[PDB]
Design a binder for this molecule. Structure first.
Ligand code: F3Q
Length: 144
């Protein structure tokens, strides 16, 4: 199947933020299994690297004017050597962490921007690989 990558991003971020006590109203609402499997994969990745995640918080020092550069720098590093599902999970978890950090640092408007930046990058740079590699349904089989 083929999905709406914007919807995948928005659902992923909205859930992560709602869990943590922020209702992201600007971003409020086979597909179902994709959303759930991606969330669980990201949570597994967060657990797997729990202490590196904890530590990362201090590394980024986000501000509105630097946030895009900080985001893009990491995304470029993640995919410099090509695409695979692991790096896609890392990309979703990184975006989600950036949204949580934006809320925590009293910069909640950045959530909307991060969601856009993630969607643009999926659209432009990852979708061909996803489609070629069996789509999100292949991800579900591999991670489910
Ligand atoms: O710089 C990064 C980062 C995270 C990964 C990464 C991606 C993966 C993965 C693995 C790692 C990884 O390399 N780590 C995971 C991790 C997780 C959380 C925080 C830091 C790190 C760094 C190291 C952990 N080390 C690796 C060597 O052995 C000891 C543990 O398996 C599947 O996909 N990679 C990078 C940079 C480029 C190589 C891969 N972040 C980053 C971003 C901002 C600031 C600092 C680091 C980043 C990117 C995406 C994320 O979801 C989270 C982190």
């Amino acid at each position: 199947g083929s999905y709406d990558n914007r919807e995948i991003v928005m659902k992923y971020i909205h859930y992560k933020l709602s869990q943590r006590g922020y209702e992201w109203d600007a971003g409020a609402d086979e597909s179902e299994v994709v959303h759930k499997t991606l969330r669980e994969a990201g949570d597994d990745f967060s657990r797997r690297y729990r202490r590196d995640f904890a530590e990362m918080s201090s590394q980024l020092h986000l501000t509105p004017f630097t946030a895009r550069g900080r985001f893009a720098t990491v995304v470029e590093e993640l995919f410099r050597d090509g695409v695979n599902w692991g790096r896609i999970v890392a990309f979703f978890e990184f975006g989600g962490v950036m949204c949580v950090e934006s809320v925590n640092r009293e910069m909640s408007p950045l959530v909307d921007n991060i969601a856009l930046w993630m969607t643009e990058y999926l659209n432009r740079h990852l979708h061909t690989w996803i489609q070629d590699n069996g789509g999100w349904d292949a991800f579900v089989e591999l991670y489910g």
